[PDB]
Amino acid sequence: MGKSEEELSDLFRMFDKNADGYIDLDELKIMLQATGETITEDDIEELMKDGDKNNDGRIDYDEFLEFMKGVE
Ligand SMILES: O=C(O[C@@H]1Cc2c(O)cc(O)cc2O[C@@H]1c1cc(O)c(O)c(O)c1)c1cc(O)c(O)c(O)c1
Ligand SMILES: [Ca+2]
Ligand SMILES: [Ca+2]
């Protein structure tokens, strides 16, 4: 489970299937897969824009918040 930065950190590295400290786009579409996210490929980028509004090519814990910001 992931609540505040206290657990967010662990919940973050736990989602990165590649296991490299960060999460790429090819892993995002699979990160929500465990939930059953069945959408076209044009909708995936719709989630990254929030996880990485800077579009630097990588999502870091610091940006992981802009995606969760306390959601449920
Ligand atoms: O991106 C989705 O989950 C994100 C990852 C995630 C998680 O792994 C564990 C957890 O405790 C909370 C959590 O919130 C995330 C999230 C990100 C968003 O941008 C968002 O709008 C949202 O409602 C939530 C998502 C997609 C969905 O299609 C969906 O229906 C949903 O309810 C959620
Ligand atoms: Ca990664
Ligand atoms: Ca970024």
Swiss-Prot record:
Task: Provide the positions where the record notes the PTM Phosphoserine.
Answer: 9
Where, by residue number, does Ca(2+) 2 bind? 16, 18, 20, 22, 27
Q: Where is the EF-hand domain?
A: 3-38, 39-72
Q: Which disease is it linked to?
A: Cardiomyopathy, dilated, 1Z: A disorder characterized by ventricular dilation and impaired systolic function, resulting in congestive heart failure and arrhythmia. Patients are at risk of premature death.
Family as reported in the entry's similarity comment: Belongs to the troponin C family.
Q: What does this protein do?
A: Troponin is the central regulatory protein of striated muscle contraction. Tn consists of three components: Tn-I which is the inhibitor of actomyosin ATPase, Tn-T which contains the binding site for tropomyosin and Tn-C. The binding of calcium to Tn-C abolishes the inhibitory action of Tn on actin filaments.
Q: What else is known?
A: Cardiac muscle Tn-C can bind 3 calcium ions per molecule. Domain I does not bind calcium.
Record-given protein name = Troponin C, slow skeletal and cardiac muscles
UniProt organism field? Homo sapiens
What stretch of the complete protein does the chain hold?
91 to 161 of 161
